[model samples]
Target: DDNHLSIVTLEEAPFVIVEDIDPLTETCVRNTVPCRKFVKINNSTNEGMNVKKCCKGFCIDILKKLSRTVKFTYDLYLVTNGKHGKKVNNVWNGMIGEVVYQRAVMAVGSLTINEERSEVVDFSVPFVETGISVMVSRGTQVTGLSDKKFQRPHDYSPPFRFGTVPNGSTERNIRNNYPYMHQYMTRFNQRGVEDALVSLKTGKLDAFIYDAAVLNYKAGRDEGCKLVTIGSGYIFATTGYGIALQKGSPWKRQIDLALLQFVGDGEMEELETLWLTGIC
Candidate 1:
């Protein structure tokens, strides 16, 4: 019998990024060929649709490795709502929802592992370390001198306006832990890292707070080098991005074994080097 699984993800740079496949060959290498733009569809209506675009980057590479090592074939698709996951009215949504409802066997990307998410879904060993950080336009004068003082939500004299992806861990952390920060938050109409960065560049926001690795990647390579990361990256919490699975999944052990082996053999580091460095 064939072991085939379905996986769900979202586009998050240096992690899971979608690209167009060659029309002639219907395939393309990561970053080498032009990627086709994927059409957006509502979560409920995507049941019968096929994944027409191709994807690459850190998470895709890892998924490819795990599939080969674990001996499973798979289909990949994007989360229609474009959210990582959030609990609304006590029901989970986004990639976690896909796994919780058994629509997909696994959810991959830069999916962070946290206590709240851990209750509903099992996570493999973290593939990448991450944390929340602040980003601002280049040469913006930050008032607070000390990193500790800067991270404190109430330290700024004028109400500091910052934003992050809506309904994400970064937003939840601010709402739960930094009530003062939450008061000054601006909601992004579009919920993606690039959107937040564009808002920062366009002066719609004072700062953008999100995963440090993502911000760092953008700040380093962003057009005209107009972005900068401020404060210690882990101003909020130190965490790692993991592959999410349905609670009590049998594949968890197998996935963990493959991940551990990649770490032990330096393959994980190589992927980091390939995707994470020298772009700045």
Candidate 2:
């Protein structure tokens, strides 16, 4: 247990991860609180897989670079989808268990650093910044007061109809920010943005509200579909991505040092180019 590197992760898009890439898991997982049910395996040499090999996306790439730079072997832990594990409110529970359970000072690349998260554990300077996003049908007017066909409607309602991926910040944001839109939106997360876009094209759903860049990435596939870009694409700042460390852990300095090197060396720029370009 002393030498362990069981990283925890969630199965969200733009970050959907599967430990057993050999036969990838059928469903996507996202920002989950750590628990025992997650699949635990020795972190393998990600060098074998094409592109980034750690989890599924950029996280793996960063980990690969860290492993090569720091020169340490680690283990991989494929987190169970929300279906199996108890959705956790904190990361320490998982870390603590991984300690008594595995005994390690492991890093949690899957976590988002914020005031609440920082209260429980330490974090490095931001390594990334992103947010859950949604897609809207071009010229959708799903806002305002409705006719006798509907009971209630917003005053300036548009003709647009919407669909979204389930759960978490994205769901909450759609509900909160677009309370009016939320009132009429549909859930087709299982169908994915592409399928949802089909619904939009055929006029079933006016828009598909899910990941921001993912929509852009998928947009190239269809000519009719376009981005509504919340506030030019509904978004907020402080969404900066960062690394999580033990509360008050000095490792923050070293990890931050690495990030400093990353910025100084333009590693992140290289990464953004590789990922967002093709995808977007």
Candidate 3:
């Protein structure tokens, strides 16, 4: 009876795809995957509006294939509050929460797989691999403030404010593996990396710790140029991403196959080129 794939995802750039129906052509155009810029304009007429055309750069690309081969209709949308997910009292909540509860078909993105998460939800094999690091403004506490020479990570005497994506893998790792740095931070605010970067820009935050790949992407963006990544040796841990689904979903096999197909077909390389090469 359920023919539609109700999917939940993040509106993050390069990963969020927007479908725009051109009024004149009455045809849909999709763009704005990550590096490319897209915008929608109105002609001042009584017609349907458009959104700036829009991945891991993984989820959209892979799921699109599934729709074609597996022959399923789907609906994709963003989480209202932009959280990936968080665990409270051993219960995972957020985008993956809905999927684990079977409220949606899947939660697609570069969602990492960890031991704690695997217990509740199923992953479609890792589509991307990356680790956590810190993103800092050009000169800050992490960068040694006025000191041009490099400084040790643990040398800061006074605790500085920091931020990370709340309820996500980065937070968990800090709470466990990097207990010293965890306790060293004066403020460990659980918020999206983008928001944390904004605070860093305005002198509100000392650093933003999150996925190194995402940190590099955000730091390299036009608005994020001043933001730079620090501590190459400080990568706390490695993580692999997979499509988050309810445990024991019958659709698991097909999704895994789709992922393998993409890699086997060399499409995965193409996606990496499109999304990882630059920041828009």
Candidate 4:
């Protein structure tokens, strides 16, 4: 029932769009939305163009819908000094963590709904549906490229490196996959998608496993061209992208009702086409 929310967030693209704003106005010039303000942080950018203000994506769009449906406005803030979150000792330790502890406002990133996260926070029904997939360097070869033959396939020995953002479905998916790479595939265990992609590019990681939509977006990037997904219908685990809210918060029901309405009205599918299907 709170109309004004002190929202906490991180700058993960295609979900939460971050941009720097005018110090005096505290609003980005390009931001036309009448109901929001910048979180005090180091500023931001999205797309290839540098703009003083920006905010657009599936999660942001979800927030927009919530405003209309649940009927409220919010302020965007940041955690980790304006970065993402992580899990340490089985506890969420970033933006989402702050909400768990009631330290901030709301979170609007494309956060995955997993058992661990669900234990701490309430989630609106999924706005985006995706699954875990493998992103490997193009130069690297997977075993049995063709079904006709199964020989001379390159393989990793012990201590091989793999990348996944900690505290999300990606990490748990890899660890739970049947091959048990978790026990042997040394983890980069990084914080954000960008870092994992960079590490994979520099040969620091053999593969980066994450959400299929996100991996596809990054893999299609110019710098990520050298990277390729083990495409087709193959994916490790399935999950939904949900907004993380404080457990037992009254806002959860309001947001959920809005989300359900959006799903029923086809806005959910429309957003997937707009944001999930492309990079940038």
Q: How does each model score on TM-score?
A: 0.84, 0.61, 0.73, 0.73
Instruction: Enumerate residue pairs that collide in model 4.
Output: 6-105, 7-106
lDDT of 3 by residue, 1-280 (tens): 5667877776555555444445576444453232112233545734433232332344677677777776777766555433677777766677778787776788887677787778888888888776777777766545322222212235545545666765678777766765555555435575565567778878887777787667766766646367777754245477767888888888889888888888899988898787666553
The lDDT leader among the candidates is 1
lDDT of 4 by residue, 29-141 (tens): 55333223333334464223223455666677777778777877776554553244556776677667878878765787767777777888887787676677777877655
Rank by lDDT (best first):
1, 3, 4, 2
**Clash count of each predicted structure:** 3, 30, 7, 2
Each prediction's whole-model lDDT (CA): 0.77, 0.49, 0.65, 0.65
Off by over 4 Å in 1: 28-48, 138-157, 187-190, 232-235
Model 3 error, position 93 (Å): 1.9
TM-score of 3: 0.73
Model 4: runs farther than 4 Å from truth? 23-25, 30-54, 81-87, 138-161, 175-180, 187-192, 199-204, 222-226
List residue ranges in candidate 2 displaced over 4 A: 1-3, 11-56, 81-116, 140-153, 156-160, 173-198, 211-213, 220-234
How many angstroms is residue 3 displaced in model 4 relative to the true structure, after the best TM-score fit? 2.1
